[PDB]
Amino acid sequence: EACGYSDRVLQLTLGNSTITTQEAANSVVAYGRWPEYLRDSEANPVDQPTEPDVAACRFYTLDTVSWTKESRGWWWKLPDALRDMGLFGQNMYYHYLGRSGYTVHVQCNASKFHQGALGVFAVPEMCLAGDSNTTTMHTSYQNANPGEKGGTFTGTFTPDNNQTSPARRFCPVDYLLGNGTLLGNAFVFPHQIINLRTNNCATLVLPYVNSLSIDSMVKHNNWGIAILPLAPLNFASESSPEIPITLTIAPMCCEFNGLRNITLPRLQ
Amino acid sequence: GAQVSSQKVGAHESTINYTTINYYRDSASNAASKQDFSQDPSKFTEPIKDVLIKTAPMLN
Amino acid sequence: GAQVSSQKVGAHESTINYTTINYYRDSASNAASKQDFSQDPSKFTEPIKDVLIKTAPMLN
Amino acid sequence: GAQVSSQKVGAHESTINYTTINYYRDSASNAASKQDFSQDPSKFTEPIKDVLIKTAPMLN
Amino acid sequence: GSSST
Amino acid sequence: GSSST
Amino acid sequence: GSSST
Amino acid sequence: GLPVMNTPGSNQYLTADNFQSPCALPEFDVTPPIDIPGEVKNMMELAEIDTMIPFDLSATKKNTMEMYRVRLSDKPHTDDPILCLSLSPASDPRLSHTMLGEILNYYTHWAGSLKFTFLFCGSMMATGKLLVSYAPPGADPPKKRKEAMLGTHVIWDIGLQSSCTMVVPWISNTTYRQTIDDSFTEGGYISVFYQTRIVVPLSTPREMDILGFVSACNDFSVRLLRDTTHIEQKA
Amino acid sequence: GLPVMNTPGSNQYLTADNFQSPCALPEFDVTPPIDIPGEVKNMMELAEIDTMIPFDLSATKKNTMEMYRVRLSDKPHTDDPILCLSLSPASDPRLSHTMLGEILNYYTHWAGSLKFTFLFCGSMMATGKLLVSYAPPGADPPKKRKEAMLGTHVIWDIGLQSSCTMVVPWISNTTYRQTIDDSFTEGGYISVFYQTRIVVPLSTPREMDILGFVSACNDFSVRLLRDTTHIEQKA
Amino acid sequence: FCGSMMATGKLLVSYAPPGADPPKKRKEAMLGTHVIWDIGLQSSCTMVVPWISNTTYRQT
Amino acid sequence: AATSRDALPNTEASGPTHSKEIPALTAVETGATNPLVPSDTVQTRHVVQHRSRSESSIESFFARGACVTIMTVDNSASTTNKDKLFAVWKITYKDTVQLRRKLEFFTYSRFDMELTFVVTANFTETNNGHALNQVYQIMYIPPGAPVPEKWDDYTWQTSSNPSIFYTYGTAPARISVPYVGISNAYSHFYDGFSKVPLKDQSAALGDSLYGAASLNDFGILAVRVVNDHNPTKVTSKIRVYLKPKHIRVWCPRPPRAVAYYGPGVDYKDGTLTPLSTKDLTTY
Amino acid sequence: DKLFAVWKITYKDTVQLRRKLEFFTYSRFDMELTFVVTANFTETNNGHALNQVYQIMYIPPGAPVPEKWDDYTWQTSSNPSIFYTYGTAPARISVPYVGISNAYSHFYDGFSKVPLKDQSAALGDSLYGAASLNDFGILAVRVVNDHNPTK
Amino acid sequence: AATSRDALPNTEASGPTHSKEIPALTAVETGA
Ligand SMILES: CCCCCCCCCCCCC/C=C\[C@H](O)[C@H](N)CO
Ligand SMILES: CCCCCCCCCCCCC/C=C\[C@H](O)[C@H](N)CO
Ligand SMILES: *C(=O)CCCCCCCCCCCCC
Ligand SMILES: *C(=O)CCCCCCCCCCCCC
Ligand SMILES: *C(=O)CCCCCCCCCCCCC
């Protein structure tokens, strides 16, 4: 626009929180669907829902991770990554059922002399593969659900051989997208790329997606966020460059059904 | 209760038609009509918030 | 003598119909239509002589 | 969707007809109608640029 | 001929 | 319904 | 009777 | 003959099929119906009738009249459960044999709201307030009033209206639940507590029974017909 | 009975047939659909999405993240290929495993236009001009810019618009090509060259990656369904 | 921001209304009113501290 | 209103260009694919396009019966250490691989199920003794109904479970099933557990399989030879073919690239290298 | 191993239909395939066999050809198969005009490759008059039954 | 006229209450 408006410069405001960016590459709305509340014609639990509105639909910033030449990739699950985030987490553990959409904003700036590219993928039902070749489907709840720290990808499959006390964790191999399918095809999932010469962030607006209108947020993750270095970090001639990656995520249109006492999960 | 539809005639020897009658109460018992619709790829190929004009710079 | 009725269509690929013709003189030979009616449970659930108003005291 | 056509009746015992209904969506599944056309042999028998008048000298 | 329910 | 050739 | 698509 | 082509399924016998077949007794003079009272048109009508719950299936009380009696007494207030029951209407042993439970065992899937009604059977002189709870699944099952209060509940004041009903509203992730014990389609927790205590005057029994009943609401349905496990025929 | 005459085909089971058959669960209460995001109506919609090409299938780079990275550097101008690829979308090893390639392996025939998009991932300070080529089949496959220039091509100037697309227009003798390597239905040659060279200032990486993507145009279609060779089940 | 044009960065500016532990870590400050500032051509960024008070006027 | 068998767009003739319009330049970071057509980057002629996408509609892509299991039964005399063999199978599309891979191009689906049963028998021992034509009973046992412990026990009465009595050598049996899911769609992937592990509970007690939802998702098929036994032994196999009719699918996924290793998305060491060697600058 | 058969679809293995088609250079048609199936005992033993079911799988060019009578390809999730029951009516299916050209060529005066000078002779070589190597694919047929003591 | 395949009643939205209307209290002795 002749009054300055740009595809690269955005402001997002949800609740008492604002994000600004001056180097965006537009933003994505997954499958073209904006988040919505559950409609009466698709409703299922009959009790009055709880809708925390601004108390939970606001931007929460997770722990910042670090991108280096040796980084193979990072992953998070939703709602799991937000389980300890203010009143969203509270509302989640007090109710049997919950549904929510999200604005996911991945942040990573550098300089005109750095280079590298992160593929940021939002995957519905991001089932990841386990570490065992003696057993299948055995990743424990605790290891499946890292909370805000997320997990990481590896370039090597390495099977857990301790049969006495199995690790029971995922072993998500990067070129296999951690699930036995080729990473080059992950672009059919809603995504953006942070290519440092072009942009310093990715913004994905995710609808609630599920085979049900509402479900157990504590038992089930609807979305997975996978971030992988499509082109590796590089800077000047430094052998060991580093730049930070920060995730800020906001729940949108979340509602909860089936209120009782709070869930106290076994997380370790 | 007969349903009359047209065939898309491939190799040739007016519209040629074919007839269909459902014999059962349950729609699950029915054959597939193959009278299906198409849609635009956009929700997967252009999932961006601001409409893309292909002659224009994608980044502006 | 054909009877045309509608299916309640469950998974989808207008009203889809199906056709039925009775081939025999005896109604006993016929298939079941499954076009059945419902009724209120009252004769079993509220068999009382004086109509119950649920917001009211049942005993008064 | 029934198609009614006439038979060319050879040995005899009005027009006698026969009926055809296509049961499938694909025209490839259909029987052959045998309702075919003829054409003049000319493209093979008189492929010459100047029309031939048979009473006339072919070469002039 | 035909009944339609 | 019916075609007649 | 007949539908025609 | 008319040209025909036999398709798959030809000559099979599916016990669920719905075909015509020749009558072995042609022109038989059928006896007309008469208007017999009590006609039923749908099995869910029977599911909507209150039937009594065998709550106390202790080793000595099960398979006796005692299993239906929940004993209360006038002891001082406690936050400890009078009873605890899983909302698994076709499979929890206390619910599976009720008329609702029984009908559900002929089907694979159930859905809709339920209601529990309790009947106080102490003397007129006995007073009390109880708390009836429903905790949807996913947390620690309530063992203290403190937890049960936080879920769906009715505080029951004992008096002339002898009975009290708590509706378990349909609150589920799936559109239908399984009629077997299944964690994915679990229903949660029914429990009953003392709100104050049972109080009696002198010359009065200090202990008494309450009875409990379950029935389906009008939004309740079942599907996928199946054989039950509640009857068999060995040899 | 109505006189009928059984025709050939009677009693067979063709796995591709389309007949009616009796329902094993009559009057079942089906759960309604809900409006789940991301509905697909035709497999070619997926073929139109860009997916990334494993260009560098060298012995050490294949089956690793590296196979997706095409390395460029700021070396002096050469007329020698950055990469060379055969237009055999279902069978060339670099294309066959892309989402397009994968879908094509369930079909025998493909037709229509394709497009290759390259993404420059060097630093902002890096500049360059590249030449992306498509040579329809029938001559010596291009190994020098000189030959590649004579075919369909796009000269790409690197800058703020990070990516560039070359459309491989449908240019074929046959109406559909085979989804296997076949000389009669060969598609020709994709190649990429340096037009000028990559130039960087000081304090800048001298080497960088470009990434490549393939997708189908709106005039693209497939036919004759078939089993793929990209999955098996030994024992 | 008064660094050079080549300098980039994202900062978080926070306002936490009174009554809890004053924020000493981003974790706490994120939960209150905030603006995430991306450094670039628009040199400056503003965070509005909205009037959020129990009393109608505060003491100076 | 555009249908699967409609022809695709015509190529419109287009000439030389020299402008600020830049179709060819784009930016894949946005997450979008550049919607180009040949007339955007080369000169084109007018072509009237006849081709259609009819055979790649979701329905047409799936409109085939696929083998999902083979069940073995026999007709032998039950004797103190071994009984007459009847078969039991937990309904699934994950015991074989081809239909599974096709379904897994998508995250969720809805469809009516067509099951076709091909039945074959043979003699296993040398004696010239014969057998008479076998009838088979294929009983569908939905989750909760009693599973048969013996080829001849009370459950084969089937008063409520659907059964097919198939006669040997007749046309392959076939039945249809509606969309029977307890969710609004079938989930090809479930990133979750059927139980929450609680802290106040033992680990064993809160444990469940990753990615499994209902333990007995769809129930069982139990198959038996109804005939009493012959002096000679006959073994039979029932091959089950599944076709998804009237199908809808949501959320596309990259296809399975490495061998299946169980019902989940797990993979085995030694199977992780699908791609073959090919030089960067070799056609 | 147990014998299953593989056939490359063609009208040129026999002579009569070939001669009739070759009165013409090009053709278009829908194909009707009818299958007549016959069995016999090969060895003297009085041991019997039960009724056989046959699987006729159409494997289009590119799909995996079976190496064993019982391997994974016989699952047919996408290839069309006919399960034929012995002693029933001969099986029959129809096929549309499936040519990749606008007509079937009964004669192709050419090669599928151009020999280039900068290439070896071996590398530019191809058969005279052949166009697509696997024009129409394969039929693979097997007895689905397990084996009998008798052959 | 209500048929076996008709959908069951909708749940109607309902709010807080404080009245002499006592749906929850009842008396099963009546037989209802
Ligand atoms: C007499 C034969 C009756 C056969 C009745 C079969 C009824 C059961 C239908 C099962 C539906 C299976 C659907 C496929 C699998 C699921 O999509 C996924 N694993 C997730 O839900
Ligand atoms: C389950 C059975 C399916 C059978 C499917 C067969 C599909 C293939 C049809 C082949 C068409 C062959 C046409 C005849 C030959 C050609 O005309 C000439 N040799 C030149 O093109
Ligand atoms: C609509 O169907 C009216 C016309 C009836 C035409 C003849 C029907 C052919 C036989 C169908 C038998 C019924 C199948 C259950
Ligand atoms: C009413 O049925 C008039 C229309 C007749 C339609 C065709 C009937 C199909 C064959 C039925 C044969 C009679 C069965 C005893
Ligand atoms: C046009 O066909 C309308 C009249 C219908 C006449 C009876 C049809 C006879 C049975 C055909 C069954 C459908 C075959 C798929």
How many other C-beta atoms can be found within 10 angstroms of the C-beta atom of residue L121? 9
> Experimental method used, please?
X-ray
Residue nearest to atom 14 of ligand 4 (CA): C23
- For chain G, give the longest Cα–Cα distance: 14
Which atom, in ligand 2's list, is nearest to the CA of L57?
1
Tokens of K54: 């009819």
> Is some CB atom of chain K closer than 8 A to the CB atom of A115?
no
> Is some CB atom of chain B closer than 8 A to the CB atom of D19?
no
Which CATH number does the domain H1-235 belong to among 3.20.20.370, 2.60.120.20, 2.60.40.740, 3.40.47.10? 2.60.120.20
Of K108, K138, K186, K221, which is best to mutate to test ligand 1, by the most ligand atoms within 8 angstroms of its C-beta?
Answer: K186
Query: What DSSP state is assigned to residue A144?
Result: H
> Is some CB atom of chain L closer than 8 A to the CB atom of B10?
yes
**Cα–Cα distance measured from residue K164 to residue H15, given in angstroms and rounded to the nearest whole number:** 7
Please work out whether the CB of residue C24 comes within 6 Å of at least one atom of ligand 4: no
3-state secondary structure of I176: coil
Q: Do K52 and I188 touch, CB atoms closer than 8 A?
A: no
**Phi, psi at C28, each rounded to 5°:** -60, -30
CB neighbours of M7 closer than 8 A, spacing ≥ 6?
A: none
Q: Do I231 and K103 touch, CB atoms closer than 8 A?
A: no
> Is some CB atom of chain A closer than 8 A to the CB atom of K184?
yes
**Cα–Cα distance measured from residue L29 to residue L96, given in angstroms and rounded to the nearest whole number:** 7
Query: What DSSP state is assigned to residue I150?
Result: T
Q: Looking at chain C, how many residues does it have?
A: 60
- Preceding amide of A79 cis, omega within 30: yes
**Cα–Cα distance measured from residue A249 to residue A246, given in angstroms and rounded to the nearest whole number:** 10
Q: Exposed, middle or buried by CB within 10 Å (0-12, 13-18, 19+), for H229? A: middle
Residue nearest to atom 5 of ligand 2 (CA): L58
**Cα–Cα distance measured from residue K73 to residue K112, given in angstroms and rounded to the nearest whole number:** 28
**Cα–Cα distance measured from residue A263 to residue A258, given in angstroms and rounded to the nearest whole number:** 12
Rounded to a whole number of angstroms, the distance from the CA of G2 to the nearest CA of chain B is 5
> Is some CB atom of chain H closer than 8 A to the CB atom of K116?
yes
> Is some CB atom of chain K closer than 8 A to the CB atom of B48?
yes
Q: Exposed, middle or buried by CB within 10 Å (0-12, 13-18, 19+), for K44? A: middle
**Cα–Cα distance measured from residue H169 to residue I183, given in angstroms and rounded to the nearest whole number:** 68
Chain C residues whose CB is inside 8 A of the E2 CB are 2-4
Angle at C37 between CA C32 and CA C40, to 5 degrees: 145
H9 φ/ψ sector (left φ>0, alpha ψ -120 to 50, else beta):
left
Distance (angstroms) between ligand 1 centre and the Cα of L44 equals 47
Best of C6, C7, C33, C37 to disrupt the M interface by mutation (most M CBs within 10 Å)?
A: C37
CB neighbours of A40 closer than 8 A, spacing ≥ 6?
A: none
- For chain F, give the longest Cα–Cα distance: 14
Rounded to a whole number of angstroms, the distance from the CA of I178 to the nearest CA of chain L is 8
How many other C-beta atoms can be found within 10 angstroms of the C-beta atom of residue L151? 11
- Nearest CA to L10 among L40, L39, L31? L31
Tokens of L21: 């088609």
Tokens of B26: 């349950």
3-state secondary structure of A107: strand
I–J touching, 3+ CB–CB pairs within 8 Å = no
Residue by residue, DSSP assigns chain K as --BTTSBPPPBPPB----SS--TTEE-GGGSPPP---GGGTS-B--B----B-GGGBHHHHH-S-EEEEEEEEE----BTTB----EEEE--S-SSSHHHHHHTTEEEEEEEEEEEEEEEEEE-S------PPPEEEEEEE-TTSPPPSSTTSGGGG-SSS-EEEEETTSS-EEEEE----SSSSEES---B-SSPPBTTS-HHHH---TT--STTSS-EEEEEE-SPPPSS-EEEEEEEEEEEEEEEEEEE-PPB-S---SSSS---TT----PPPB-TT--
Rounded to a whole number of angstroms, the distance from the CA of E3 to the nearest CA of chain C is 5
Please tell me the number of the ligand nearest to residue L93's CA. Answer: 2
Outline where DSSP puts E strands in D1-60: 2-6, 17-20
**Cα–Cα distance measured from residue D55 to residue K61, given in angstroms and rounded to the nearest whole number:** 64
Residue by residue, DSSP assigns chain H as -EEE-PPTTTT-EETT-------SSTT--PPPP---S---S-HHHHHTS-EE------TTTTTSGGGG-EEEE-PPP--S-SEEEES-TTTSTTTTTSHHHHHHTTEEEEES-EEEEEEE-S-TT-B-EEEEEEE-SSSPPP-SHHHHTTSEEEEEE-SSS-EEEEEE----SSSSEESS--STT---EEEEEESS--B--TTS-SEEEEEEEEEE-TT-EEEEE---SS-----
Distance (angstroms) between ligand 4 centre and the Cα of C1 equals 6
3-state secondary structure of I99: helix
Please tell me the number of the ligand nearest to residue I3's CA. Answer: 4
Query: What DSSP state is assigned to residue I16?
Result: T
Please work out whether the CB of residue K162 comes within 6 Å of at least one atom of ligand 1: yes
3-state secondary structure chain L: CCCCEEEECCCCCCCHHHHHHCCCCEECCCEEEEECCCCCCCCCCCCCCCCCEEEEEEECCCCCCCCCCCCHHHHCCCCCEEEEECCCCCEEEEECCCCCCCCEECCCCCCCCCCCCCCCHHHHCCCCCCCCCCCCCEEEEEECCCCCCCC
Mark yes or no for CB contact L53/K102 under 8 Å: no
**Cα–Cα distance measured from residue K132 to residue K232, given in angstroms and rounded to the nearest whole number:** 10
Please tell me the number of the ligand nearest to residue L33's CA. Answer: 2
> Is some CB atom of chain B closer than 8 A to the CB atom of C50?
no
Domain range list for chain B: 1-60
Q: A1-268 in CATH: which number?
A: 2.60.120.20
Half-sphere exposure of C46 (CA within 13 A, CB side): 11
Domain range list for chain I: 1-235
- Nearest CA to K257 among A181, I57, I99? A181
**Cα–Cα distance measured from residue A124 to residue A140, given in angstroms and rounded to the nearest whole number:** 20
Mark yes or no for CB contact A17/J34 under 8 Å: yes
Please work out whether the CB of residue L108 comes within 6 Å of at least one atom of ligand 2: no
**Cα–Cα distance measured from residue I103 to residue I51, given in angstroms and rounded to the nearest whole number:** 12
Best of C6, C40, C44, C59 to disrupt the M interface by mutation (most M CBs within 10 Å)?
A: C59
Q: K1-283 in CATH: which number?
A: 2.60.120.20
Name the residue among K67, K96, K171 with its Cβ closest to that of L85: K171
Query: What DSSP state is assigned to residue I174?
Result: S
- Nearest CA to A181 among A123, A231, A116? A123
CB neighbours of B42 closer than 8 A, spacing ≥ 6?
A: A32
Q: Do L74 and I200 touch, CB atoms closer than 8 A?
A: no
H187 φ/ψ sector (left φ>0, alpha ψ -120 to 50, else beta):
alpha
Please tell me the number of the ligand nearest to residue C25's CA. Answer: 4
Please work out whether the CB of residue B23 comes within 6 Å of at least one atom of ligand 3: yes
Distance (angstroms) between ligand 2 centre and the Cα of L138 equals 9
Distance (angstroms) between ligand 4 centre and the Cα of E1 equals 9
- Tell me, in Å, the resolution of the deposited structure: 2.9
Tokens of A12: 């997002």
Q: Which chains are adjacent to chain C, needing at least 3 Cβ pairs under 8 Å?
A: B, E, H, I, K, M
- Nearest CA to M9 among A255, C40, A211? C40
Q: Do M8 and H219 touch, CB atoms closer than 8 A?
A: yes
Mark yes or no for CB contact B58/K34 under 8 Å: yes
Mark yes or no for CB contact H162/M4 under 8 Å: no
Tokens of A137: 């489907």
Please name every residue paired with I211 in a beta bridge, in sequence order, or none if there are none. I119
Mark yes or no for CB contact M31/C48 under 8 Å: yes
Chain centre to alpha carbon of residue A40: 29
Interstrand relation of A28-29 and A201-206 (parallel, antiparallel or unpaired): parallel
CATH fold of D1-60, please?
Rhinovirus 14, subunit 4 (4.10.80)
**Cα–Cα distance measured from residue K227 to residue K230, given in angstroms and rounded to the nearest whole number:** 9
Listed by number, the residues of chain B in 30-49 with a beta carbon closer than 8 Å to a beta carbon of chain C are 30, 32-33, 35-36
Rounded to a whole number of angstroms, the distance from the CA of I125 to the nearest CA of chain A is 6
Handedness of CA L5, L11, L15, L16 (dihedral sign): positive
Q: Exposed, middle or buried by CB within 10 Å (0-12, 13-18, 19+), for K192? A: buried
CB neighbours of A81 closer than 8 A, spacing ≥ 6?
A: A62, A146, A147, A148, A150, A225, A247, A249
3-state secondary structure of A69: coil
Please work out whether the CB of residue K115 comes within 6 Å of at least one atom of ligand 1: yes
Interstrand relation of C2-6 and E2-4 (parallel, antiparallel or unpaired): parallel
**Cα–Cα distance measured from residue H157 to residue H127, given in angstroms and rounded to the nearest whole number:** 8
Handedness of CA K246, K252, K258, K260 (dihedral sign): negative
Q: Which residues of chain K approach chain B closer than 8 Å at the C-beta?
A: 1-6, 21-23, 25-27, 30-36, 40, 53-54, 57-60, 63, 112-113, 176-179, 245-246, 252
- Nearest CA to A225 among A87, A123, A83? A123
